[PDB]
Short mmCIF file of C-alpha atoms in Angstrom, two decimals:
data_model
loop_
_atom_site.label_atom_id
_atom_site.label_comp_id
_atom_site.label_asym_id
_atom_site.label_seq_id
_atom_site.Cartn_x
_atom_site.Cartn_y
_atom_site.Cartn_z
CA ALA A 1392 0.00 0.00 0.00
CA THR A 1393 1.07 3.56 -0.64
CA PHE A 1394 1.04 6.28 2.01
CA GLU A 1395 1.61 9.88 0.97
CA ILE A 1396 2.81 11.90 3.98
CA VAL A 1397 2.41 15.67 3.56
CA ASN A 1398 3.60 18.43 5.86
CA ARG A 1399 1.18 21.37 5.59
CA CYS A 1400 2.54 22.91 8.81
CA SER A 1401 4.46 26.15 8.59
CA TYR A 1402 7.33 24.47 10.47
CA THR A 1403 9.57 21.55 9.59
CA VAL A 1404 8.69 18.12 10.93
CA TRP A 1405 10.58 14.85 10.84
CA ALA A 1406 8.10 12.17 9.81
CA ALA A 1407 8.51 8.65 11.16
CA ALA A 1408 6.99 5.31 10.17
CA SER A 1409 7.49 2.10 12.14
CA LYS A 1410 5.80 -1.13 13.15
CA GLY A 1411 7.61 -1.21 16.48
CA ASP A 1412 10.29 -3.75 15.64
CA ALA A 1413 11.20 -2.42 12.19
CA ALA A 1414 11.08 0.68 10.08
CA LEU A 1415 8.42 1.04 7.43
CA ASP A 1416 10.09 2.06 4.16
CA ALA A 1417 13.01 4.36 5.10
CA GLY A 1418 11.56 4.88 8.59
CA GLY A 1419 11.90 8.64 8.72
CA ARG A 1420 12.62 11.80 6.76
CA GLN A 1421 12.74 15.57 7.15
CA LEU A 1422 9.68 17.32 5.67
CA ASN A 1423 9.93 21.06 5.25
CA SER A 1424 6.69 23.03 4.97
CA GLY A 1425 4.81 21.78 1.92
CA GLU A 1426 6.95 18.71 1.24
CA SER A 1427 5.55 15.26 0.56
CA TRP A 1428 7.05 11.82 1.16
CA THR A 1429 5.57 8.73 -0.44
CA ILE A 1430 6.26 5.39 1.20
CA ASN A 1431 5.34 1.81 0.41
CA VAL A 1432 4.08 -0.39 3.24
CA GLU A 1433 4.07 -4.14 2.73
CA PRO A 1434 0.58 -5.71 2.56
CA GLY A 1435 -0.43 -7.47 5.75
CA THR A 1436 1.47 -5.06 8.02
CA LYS A 1437 -0.14 -5.11 11.47
CA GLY A 1438 0.37 -2.39 14.04
CA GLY A 1439 2.01 0.23 11.85
CA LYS A 1440 2.24 3.84 13.01
CA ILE A 1441 3.10 7.17 11.42
CA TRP A 1442 3.89 10.28 13.44
CA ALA A 1443 5.65 13.62 13.28
CA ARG A 1444 8.66 14.61 15.34
CA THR A 1445 9.41 18.24 16.20
CA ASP A 1446 12.54 20.24 16.97
CA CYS A 1447 15.09 17.67 15.87
CA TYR A 1448 18.83 17.78 15.37
CA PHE A 1449 20.61 15.03 13.44
CA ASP A 1450 24.26 14.71 12.49
CA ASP A 1451 25.58 13.41 9.17
CA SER A 1452 25.21 9.80 10.39
CA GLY A 1453 21.48 10.10 11.13
CA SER A 1454 21.88 10.29 14.93
CA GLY A 1455 20.54 12.99 17.19
CA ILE A 1456 17.52 14.03 19.24
CA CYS A 1457 13.99 15.38 18.82
CA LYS A 1458 11.89 17.12 21.48
CA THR A 1459 8.74 15.16 20.58
CA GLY A 1460 8.49 11.69 19.13
CA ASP A 1461 12.18 10.72 19.36
CA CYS A 1462 12.76 7.07 18.40
CA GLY A 1463 16.01 6.28 20.16
CA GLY A 1464 17.90 9.16 18.59
CA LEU A 1465 17.68 7.95 14.98
CA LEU A 1466 16.52 9.78 11.89
CA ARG A 1467 15.26 6.50 10.39
CA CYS A 1468 13.05 5.06 13.11
CA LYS A 1469 12.92 1.34 13.81
CA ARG A 1470 11.07 1.72 17.11
CA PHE A 1471 8.12 3.80 18.22
CA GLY A 1472 8.55 7.37 19.40
CA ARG A 1473 8.63 9.02 22.80
CA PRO A 1474 5.37 10.77 23.80
CA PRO A 1475 3.79 13.16 23.19
CA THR A 1476 2.91 11.96 19.67
CA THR A 1477 -0.32 12.19 17.74
CA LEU A 1478 -0.53 8.75 16.09
CA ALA A 1479 -1.82 7.52 12.74
CA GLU A 1480 -2.32 3.79 13.26
CA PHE A 1481 -3.09 1.05 10.78
CA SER A 1482 -3.31 -2.68 10.17
CA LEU A 1483 -3.54 -3.76 6.55
CA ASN A 1484 -5.04 -6.77 4.78
CA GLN A 1485 -6.58 -8.33 7.88
CA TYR A 1486 -9.04 -10.85 6.42
CA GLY A 1487 -9.70 -8.61 3.45
CA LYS A 1488 -9.96 -5.29 5.31
CA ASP A 1489 -7.71 -2.43 6.36
CA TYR A 1490 -8.22 -0.75 9.75
CA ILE A 1491 -7.14 2.83 10.47
CA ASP A 1492 -7.42 5.26 13.36
CA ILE A 1493 -5.92 8.32 14.97
CA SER A 1494 -4.94 8.02 18.63
CA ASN A 1495 -4.18 10.48 21.43
CA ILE A 1496 -3.40 7.64 23.88
CA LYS A 1497 0.27 8.71 23.74
CA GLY A 1498 -0.60 12.41 23.76
CA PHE A 1499 -0.65 15.02 21.03
CA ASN A 1500 2.08 17.03 19.34
CA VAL A 1501 0.98 17.94 15.79
CA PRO A 1502 -2.53 18.08 14.24
CA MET A 1503 -3.26 15.39 11.69
CA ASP A 1504 -5.65 14.17 9.00
CA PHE A 1505 -5.53 10.48 7.99
CA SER A 1506 -7.61 9.79 4.89
CA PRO A 1507 -7.89 7.09 2.23
CA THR A 1508 -7.04 8.18 -1.32
CA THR A 1509 -8.96 5.25 -2.76
CA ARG A 1510 -12.66 4.64 -2.53
CA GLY A 1511 -14.74 2.82 0.07
CA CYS A 1512 -14.28 4.52 3.45
CA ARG A 1513 -13.91 7.86 5.21
CA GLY A 1514 -11.00 9.65 6.83
CA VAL A 1515 -10.41 10.83 10.40
CA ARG A 1516 -8.90 14.03 11.74
CA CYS A 1517 -7.66 15.58 14.97
CA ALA A 1518 -6.91 19.24 14.24
CA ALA A 1519 -7.93 21.19 17.35
CA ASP A 1520 -5.48 23.34 19.35
CA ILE A 1521 -4.75 20.67 21.92
CA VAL A 1522 -1.35 22.13 22.80
CA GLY A 1523 -2.72 25.62 23.48
CA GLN A 1524 -5.55 24.27 25.65
CA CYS A 1525 -3.52 21.49 27.34
CA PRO A 1526 -4.02 21.16 31.11
CA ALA A 1527 -1.02 22.47 33.03
CA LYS A 1528 -0.12 19.08 34.49
CA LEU A 1529 -0.02 17.48 31.02
CA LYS A 1530 1.97 20.19 29.24
CA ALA A 1531 5.29 18.92 27.98
CA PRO A 1532 8.16 21.41 28.20
CA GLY A 1533 9.61 20.31 24.88
CA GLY A 1534 6.26 20.89 23.25
CA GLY A 1535 3.04 18.99 23.05
CA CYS A 1536 0.47 17.65 25.47
CA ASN A 1537 1.20 14.35 27.22
CA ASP A 1538 -1.35 11.71 28.03
CA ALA A 1539 -2.09 11.05 31.69
CA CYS A 1540 -0.55 7.56 31.72
CA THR A 1541 2.83 8.94 30.65
CA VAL A 1542 2.66 11.66 33.30
CA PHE A 1543 1.18 9.86 36.32
CA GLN A 1544 1.81 6.12 35.74
CA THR A 1545 -1.33 4.84 37.48
CA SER A 1546 -3.26 1.67 36.70
CA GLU A 1547 -6.38 3.75 35.99
CA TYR A 1548 -4.74 6.00 33.41
CA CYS A 1549 -2.65 3.25 31.85
CA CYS A 1550 -5.51 0.67 31.96
CA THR A 1551 -3.00 -1.82 33.33
CA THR A 1552 -5.59 -4.39 34.47
CA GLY A 1553 -7.66 -4.11 31.30
CA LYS A 1554 -10.32 -2.31 33.33
CA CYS A 1555 -10.41 1.46 33.41
CA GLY A 1556 -12.86 4.24 32.78
CA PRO A 1557 -12.67 7.65 31.18
CA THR A 1558 -11.00 10.35 33.26
CA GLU A 1559 -10.93 14.14 33.41
CA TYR A 1560 -7.78 13.97 31.32
CA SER A 1561 -9.12 11.58 28.66
CA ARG A 1562 -12.26 13.70 28.34
CA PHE A 1563 -10.09 16.73 27.55
CA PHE A 1564 -8.65 15.00 24.47
CA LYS A 1565 -12.03 13.56 23.50
CA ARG A 1566 -13.82 16.90 23.71
CA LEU A 1567 -11.35 18.49 21.30
CA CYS A 1568 -10.91 15.42 19.03
CA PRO A 1569 -13.94 13.12 19.22
CA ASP A 1570 -12.72 10.96 16.31
CA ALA A 1571 -9.43 9.95 18.00
CA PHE A 1572 -8.88 7.40 20.76
CA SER A 1573 -8.58 9.22 24.08
CA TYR A 1574 -7.83 6.24 26.36
CA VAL A 1575 -7.25 2.52 26.01
CA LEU A 1576 -10.90 1.44 26.36
CA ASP A 1577 -12.47 4.33 24.48
CA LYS A 1578 -15.38 3.43 22.23
CA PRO A 1579 -13.48 2.56 19.03
CA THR A 1580 -13.11 5.22 16.37
CA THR A 1581 -11.50 2.73 14.02
CA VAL A 1582 -12.45 3.01 10.35
CA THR A 1583 -12.77 -0.07 8.17
CA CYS A 1584 -11.49 0.30 4.61
CA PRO A 1585 -11.25 -2.15 1.71
CA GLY A 1586 -8.14 -4.28 1.84
CA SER A 1587 -5.20 -2.73 -0.05
CA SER A 1588 -6.43 0.86 0.09
CA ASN A 1589 -3.96 3.76 -0.22
CA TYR A 1590 -3.74 6.70 2.16
CA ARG A 1591 -2.64 10.27 2.79
CA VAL A 1592 -1.42 11.52 6.17
CA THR A 1593 -1.43 15.34 6.33
CA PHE A 1594 0.18 17.23 9.19
CA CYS A 1595 -1.53 20.55 10.00
CA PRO A 1596 -4.45 19.90 7.61
CA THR A 1597 -6.11 23.26 8.28
CA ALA A 1598 -2.89 25.29 7.85
#
């Protein structure tokens, strides 16, 4: 499947794509404002994620640091990124269907639209000003708005036992972005698409 990743933000982002134990395509790339990066994701990939990283420095070997979404200090991510990260999540070709969502379970850094470019399903978006409205206790100094599990490390926020409810903090994310997951047991906002669809991920879609 093809994913076209577009940075419509006025600032540079470093896109990342991983399935947790491996990079997807090249795994990461700088995207200046307006730039597009097209990647190919192998059919049947389960648990893939795409995210943006902000305020990065990398040397000529591809090693450095980002203030949001850092994946072990590499430009080309093989692992997932450090919160806060708005997440585009997908599993492809699962008994003939693709499944996509946006998640704020690991916080929010950059607004996002995640839409199919082929027919048969709808897209999802989280584009509100979550960082500007972020509760003081969740604000991340490097930028972004952390989830409550990352900050407080309780069984209720992290849903450790598989039983948890919504919280004041999850409701904050859900109010601003109803179509993204706000906690582990949120009513699913997953979209079902035809198997082998193609997609666009747009950072700052309203910019």
